[PDB]
Write a protein that binds this ligand. Structure first.
Ligand SMILES: Cc1cn([C@H]2C[C@H](O)[C@@H](COP(=O)(O)OP(=O)(O)OP(=O)(O)O)O2)c(=O)[nH]c1=O
Ligand SMILES: [Ca+2]
Ligand SMILES: [Ca+2]
Ligand SMILES: [Ca+2]
Ligand SMILES: [Ca+2]
Ligand SMILES: [Ca+2]
Length: 326
DNA sequence: CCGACAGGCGCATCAG
DNA sequence: CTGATGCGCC
DNA sequence: GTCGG
């Protein structure tokens, strides 16, 4: 809210660049400026003042002056009138339609939800499901429901095997009062970086959640990652709960801390933290943190005993999950 | 002034 | 069929 | 679009 007009404008420009221009680095640079501006605890009074922040440059600062003097941005006002742009942006809101497929559909005359519904034969499976649940998936999930979903998944996981650990991550672990979707990190002692002693580890969890009707559809599913759809049970004479997006990630149990750091996010925080690690001569993924030698070649995995360890290597003070938001 | 911009899973498709 | 590439997603 | 070497 504090600089909400500025950060909205930048986010809309970041969406344009991603969805229409297909310029991912301009997308990320707009999101970086938005983010830095959103954490800045003063009402921004001029572009030159925003320019002082990291990630705000000449061009964003010029935009901020226009937005502050007039309350709008001519560049955006054009984009909002351009039918093609608006159509491509709209279509990418369906889960599974990205910038490329949206452009392709729009060239073929497919411009509306109505158009999508009467051409589902042209959609892959993921897209079919994102169309079927189009409105449900743009709804947020109150924490109260996240808590009941957590209770279902943890209990069903335990029925399959008491040694599974399932932790709910993303915005939920960051303490948010609502979440866009559910993210579940899964470990079992039989799957470590050194061996897989049991097959089907994730499949069995998925099967059990389909059996009790919690999971209702599958978008994609391999050996370590499941992306699908789930729904809380509703009681007599009640409206059904919306269908929700669910992601489950099986991580080797000895790499839990790298895994949970990745899966807690936010996405921007991970980009920032991983970019900072490179500046310090490390690389971080969801499995490990490793030094970067002269070559640019990644060395051997550093011992990691906690989340804070990872922060220590790159000389950052610990941030608790709830301070990793925005 | 200009490389580099986080890192990787699953899926669809293309060349051979 | 394998292996490489890019899309869409987290 | 931005920035540090
Ligand atoms: C989208 C995205 C997510 N992630 C990681 C960090 C996120 O917290 C988690 C992704 O799940 P998301 O559910 O996309 O993110 P979220 O839980 O933070 O936000 P929301 O409340 O809207 O659901 O995975 C990345 O590392 N990079 C990315 O680009
Ligand atoms: Ca700056
Ligand atoms: Ca989409
Ligand atoms: Ca989420
Ligand atoms: Ca998710
Ligand atoms: Ca139903």
């Amino acid at each position: 809210t504090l600089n909400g007009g500025i950060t909205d404008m930048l986010t809309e420009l970041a969406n344009f660049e991603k969805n229409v221009s297909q310029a991912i680095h301009k997308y990320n640079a707009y999101r970086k400026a938005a983010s830095v501006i959103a954490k800045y605890p003063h009402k921004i009074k001029s572009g030159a003042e925003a320019k002082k922040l990291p990630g705000v440059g000449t061009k964003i600062a010029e935009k901020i002056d226009e937005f502050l003097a007039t309350g709008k941005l001519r560049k955006l006002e054009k984009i909002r009138q351009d039918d093609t742009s608006s159509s491509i942006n709209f279509l990418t809101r369906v889960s599974g339609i990205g910038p490329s497929a949206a452009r392709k559909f729009v060239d073929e005359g497919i411009k509306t939800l109505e158009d999508l519904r009467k051409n589902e034969d042209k959609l892959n499976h993921h897209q079919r499901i994102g169309l079927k649940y189009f409105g449900d998936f743009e709804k947020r999930i109150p924490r109260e429901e996240m808590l009941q979903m957590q209770d279902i998944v943890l209990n069903e996981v335990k029925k399959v095997d008491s040694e599974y650990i399932a932790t709910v991550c993303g915005s939920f672990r960051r303490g948010a009062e609502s979440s866009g979707d559910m993210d579940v990190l899964l470990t079992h002692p039989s799957f470590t970086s050194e061996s897989t002693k049991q097959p089907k580890l994730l499949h069995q969890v998925v099967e059990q959640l389909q059996k009790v009707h919690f999971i209702t559809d599958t978008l994609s599913k391999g050996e370590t990652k499941f992306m699908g759809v789930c729904q809380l049970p509703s009681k007599n004479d009640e409206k059904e709960y919306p269908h929700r997006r669910i992601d489950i990630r099986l991580i080797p149990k000895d790499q839990y801390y790298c895994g949970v750091l990745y899966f807690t996010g936010s996405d921007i925080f991970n980009k920032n933290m991983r970019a900072h690690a490179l500046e310090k001569g490390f690389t971080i993924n969801e499995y490990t943190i490793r030094p970067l030698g002269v070559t640019g070649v990644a060395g051997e995995p550093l011992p990691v005993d906690s989340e804070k360890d990872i922060f220590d290597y790159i000389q950052w003070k610990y941030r608790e999950p709830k301070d990793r938001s925005e």
